[PDB]
Design a binder for this molecule. Structure first.
Ligand SMILES: Nc1ccc2c(NC3CC3)nc(-c3ccccc3)nc2c1
Ligand SMILES: O=C(c1ccccc1)N1CCCCC1
Length: 337
């Protein structure tokens, strides 16, 4: 049977949540989030209410994608669904989607207020372990950045799908910047590299003002593409653009990252590689020496397979609406431990 819902008004917007969640308290805005108390488990949680989940076909797909992705994530360094619920009693009236997950307080972006090498080691290690699991499901995150990294006071880290209301572009792989349709998983590794760099130094590696500037700054550090990468660019335009640029030499990373752990610097070298067929993977980075005190092959799991064939379907608004509803209805709480 269904539980007792109860109603209140909040950030101008309205919230009809179950009895079980108490003391809602907005933390800021795709949707807005409340910190609340979960009387069933005793823990503080975040309740995200989706804004306009079914406003267009693209919203309806996005809303479904997000539910599928969250329902699939079962791993310590990746955000999982505690609960999904709606005020609606039937498909016909189904209109609002709420998502519940563990509260974690802060995000890397705002905890950056320069860490020690043990900390960045533990922080990046946990990201990589998260990416292992995500990547093993054929899922790419694409927008890895500080605000999408949630960290409790235990220094425990979880990859968020979407974070609090700092540019996207600063952490994007150059091939995504050049609009390559065919990028692999290691666009996320690039992001990690940029984040690690920011923790070790306290400075955004590539603070570009736009997508041209952004690429400028990247090539300064990592050099213009050699001929081996040059020949993989299937686009006259791009090829013209960078082959027209001034030939920058690949800087020495131990000169730029002075007095960082030379193991840290090694890893950064292996992550900020221009050519994405050569970038270290999440799985291979975990075995890097830099994480020797954390690395445990027996405790770095992979995900169950994830069906994303839905990504290719062109479906009616009411069809995505109803697939979501099925996902809400078929939801199994994780065990309470
Ligand atoms: N195996 C790869 C590795 C890296 C690549 C990359 N990124 C490099 C910084 C230039 N860019 C491109 C590409 C292709 C078409 C249009 C624009 C860019 N392809 C790449 C293929
Ligand atoms: O955006 C969310 C969220 C909330 C509920 C379900 C999924 C993600 N969070 C943001 C950072 C604090 C933890 C949760």
């Amino acid at each position: 049977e269904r539980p007792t819902f109860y109603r209140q008004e909040l950030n101008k917007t309205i919230w009809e949540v179950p009895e079980r969640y108490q003391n809602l308290s907005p933390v800021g805005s795709y949707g807005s989030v409340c910190a609340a108390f979960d009387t069933k488990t005793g823990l503080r949680v975040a309740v995200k209410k989706l804004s306009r989940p079914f406003q267009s076909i693209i919203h309806a797909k996005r809303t479904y994608r997000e539910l599928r992705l969250l329902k699939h994530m079962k791993h310590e360094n990746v955000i999982g669904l505690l609960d999904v619920f709606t005020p609606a009693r039937s498909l016909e009236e189904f209109n609002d989607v709420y998502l519940v997950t563990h509260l974690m307080g802060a995000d890397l972006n705002n905890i950056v207020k320069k860490l020690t090498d043990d900390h960045v080691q533990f922080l990046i290690y946990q990201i990589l372990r998260g990416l292992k699991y995500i990547h093993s499901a054929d899922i790419i995150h694409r927008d890895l950045k500080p605000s999408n990294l949630a960290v409790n006071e235990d220094c425990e880290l979880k990859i968020l799908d979407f974070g609090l209301a700092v540019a996207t572009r600063w952490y994007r792989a150059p091939e995504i910047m050049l609009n390559w349709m065919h990028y692999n998983q290691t666009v996320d590794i690039w992001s990690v590299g940029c984040i690690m760099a920011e923790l070790l130094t306290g400075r955004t590696l590539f603070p570009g003002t736009d997508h041209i500037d952004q690429l400028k700054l990247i090539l300064r550090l990592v050099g213009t593409p050699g001929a081996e990468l040059l020949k993989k660019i299937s686009s006259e335009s791009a090829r013209n653009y960078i082959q027209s640029l001034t030939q920058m030499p690949k800087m020495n990373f131990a000169n730029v990252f002075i007095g960082a752990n030379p193991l840290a610097v090694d890893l950064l070298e292996k992550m900020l590689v221009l050519d994405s067929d050569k970038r270290i993977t999440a799985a291979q980075a975990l075995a890097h020496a830099y994480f020797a005190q954390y690395h445990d092959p027996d405790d770095e799991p992979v995900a169950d397979p994830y069906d994303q064939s839905f990504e290719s379907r062109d479906l009616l608004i009411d069809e995505w609406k109803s697939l979501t509803y099925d996902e809400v209805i078929s939801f199994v709480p994780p065990p309470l431990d």
